[PDB]
Curated annotation (Swiss-Prot), chains A, B:
Protein's recorded name: Ribonucleoside-diphosphate reductase 1 subunit beta
Gene transcribed to yield this protein: nrdB
Function: Provides the precursors necessary for DNA synthesis. Catalyzes the biosynthesis of deoxyribonucleotides from the corresponding ribonucleotides. R2 contains the tyrosyl radical required for catalysis.
Species of origin: Escherichia coli O157:H7
Quaternary structure and interacting proteins, as annotated: Tetramer of two alpha (R1) and two beta (R2) subunits. The B1 protein is a dimer of alpha subunits. A radical transfer pathway occurs between Tyr-122 of R2 and R1.
GO biological process, one term: deoxyribonucleotide biosynthetic process
Length: 349, 349
């Protein structure tokens, strides 16, 4: 029952963010939540093209890197490419069919688009620093460590999408499919969405910032500076993205948008906690993989793992979760130099 | 038959460098070979104290180094300390009892002295960068890799010294000691000296310059800069030392100083070749040990081994030996920045 232009003349200001009447007319003269309209405008103002950045010198730096430092840099590069390959398509595929207000619909399409620019930037970097890019891109799929993260992250999207299709096709209730029992529940579907949004919030607010530290650590050594200029632009976008998911999540659990969502959010509040913790742990184990052959000046397994905890505490408080780790100060305050923008607060506060 | 003041009024201008009448009066108004008088003056002009150099910042750099980069730096440090511990005492003990011209006698004492300043500089560095210097100094004796080099190098000195003692005590000829046959030969003793001088020439002209590359490579990264300032001063002295042994060796094999030495030099010309090659190989294997846990920006096993060959060819031509390696250009031309002095050519030409 998804329609690309619903014929009912509804008041889009009184629709919920999700699971309401699919958006017919795309209008921007008004909005239920102006935050999404502000995000669209900011993201539009930030528009950049990867080719604007000269990454020529990064080829030289890369070739001169010790093998284990190559491993650090290229592993990080591959992981970023994985994440935003997923973020390129997934917000559109998973969220669009469920959105019922115009400003949110357009923000999601703008969000996803900006991710394809990130993906394109990683191609721009890879083509310039390695001789055979195919080796790199193929390893993104076959790498045992990367593959584990891809599966967990993509499953939150995949389950939401499949349950959505059933909902559109069958509607709410218990059904008979080829002799099996299929129980479609809006409440369950609402839960699948909330969890998915929690996962994506962690993806962008935590997982990517761990990666930014690895990149900017080379830049601190005055290496891979072209790559760093691009990460700076990517980081500025990422601050908008996570802001978006933080408002979605908070508006959902407050009950102001949908009172039923408030209950569901409280029900799986433990699950969301466990989700964020499992992600933080997975990034700690990733630090182990990065530095398994040695570390470099200014960044190692110990330091990066501290940063994971420091950033994870911050992000979780923002979405109303208990802090899983000891209260600590910023283990790498030098990263705030790179995580800065005059138009948005990139660095976590 | 060694005398600290020989009573014969000899013409010191007509004495050989070695094995002649022990020097009685130390005079400097004249000399057989003014090169040694020029070396004394240069070395005196170069006089420095280790404490003049602030190495405080090197503690911070060192602690921030990755474990394998610590291993590189500290292994190199230990090896230098080993070499100049030997060079501190050995020129005096081994050469002084054999010298028969005043300018050479004083040069050797000045040479050895300048080495004790080098040893003292390494203590100054070690005390400032590590918490427990004893761990470091003890490893210089027990380290399997370092120990191998110490034994080979010290044996050339030890054999010369012992044969000298027999010569002074027994004189030339075949002797009976506790029922054993001891054949003292001046010709053999002259050979032991020539070989020893070849070994020391390689020690200072090759072995130490390999080490200078390792140190200045940190300085290129703007790390361990205090240490580098000291190595620069040490390198300038080393250029004098190797110049000294190059003139001793060349004056010996020319036959101008002692016609018998010319013959002996030609006899063991293969042996000297094999000596230098074995040393170059030993430094290549040392590169393997340094970088066994990984390398760093601008220096690795491959690069350092190239430098070993490049420097070894140069030093050997200077002492009239065949070149053991392919003719190559300087693999690390950046090292010449650090190997420079307005008063002496530090960099190999």
């Amino acid at each position: 029952a998804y329609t690309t232009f619903s014929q009912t003349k509804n008041d889009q200001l009184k629709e919920p963010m999700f699971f309401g009447q699919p958006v017919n007319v795309a209008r921007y003269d008004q909005q239920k939540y102006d935050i999404f309209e502000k995000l669209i405008e900011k993201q539009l103002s930030f528009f950049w093209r990867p080719e604007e950045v000269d990454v020529s010198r990064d080829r030289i730096d890369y070739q001169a890197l010790p093998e284990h430092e190559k491993h650090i840099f290229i592993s990080n590069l591959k992981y970023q490419t994985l994440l935003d390959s997923i973020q390129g398509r997934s917000p559109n595929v998973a969220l669009l069919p469920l959105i019922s207000i115009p400003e949110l619909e357009t923000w999601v399409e703008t969000w996803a688009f900006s991710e394809t620019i990130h993906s394109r930037s990683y191609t721009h970097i890879i083509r310039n620093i390695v001789n055979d890019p195919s080796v790199v891109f193929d390893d993104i799929v076959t790498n045992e460590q990367i593959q584990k993260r891809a599966e967990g992250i993509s499953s939150y999207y995949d389950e939401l999408i499949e349950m959505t299709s059933y909902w559109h096709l069958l509607g709410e209730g218990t059904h008979t499919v080829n002799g099996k029992t299929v129980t479609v529940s809006l409440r369950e579907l609402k839960k699948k969405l909330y969890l998915c949004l929690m996962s994506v919030n962690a993806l962008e607010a935590i997982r990517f910032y761990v990666s930014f530290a690895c990149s900017f650590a080379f830049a601190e050594r005055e290496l891979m500076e072209g790559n760093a200029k691009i990460i700076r632009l990517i980081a500025r976008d990422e601050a908008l993205h996570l802001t978006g998911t933080q408002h979605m999540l908070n508006l959902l659990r407050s009950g102001a948008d949908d009172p039923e969502m408030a209950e569901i959010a409280e029900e799986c509040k433990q699950e969301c906690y466990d989700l964020f913790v499992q992600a933080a742990q997975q990034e700690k184990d990733w630090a182990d993989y990065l530095f398994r052959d040695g570390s470099m000046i200014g960044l190692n397994k110990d330091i990066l793992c501290q940063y994971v905890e420091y950033i994870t505490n911050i992000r979780m408080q923002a979405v109303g979760l208990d802090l899983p780790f000891q209260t600590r100060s910023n283990p790498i305050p030098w990263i705030n130099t790179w995580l800065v923008s005059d138009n948005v607060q990139v660095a976590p506060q």
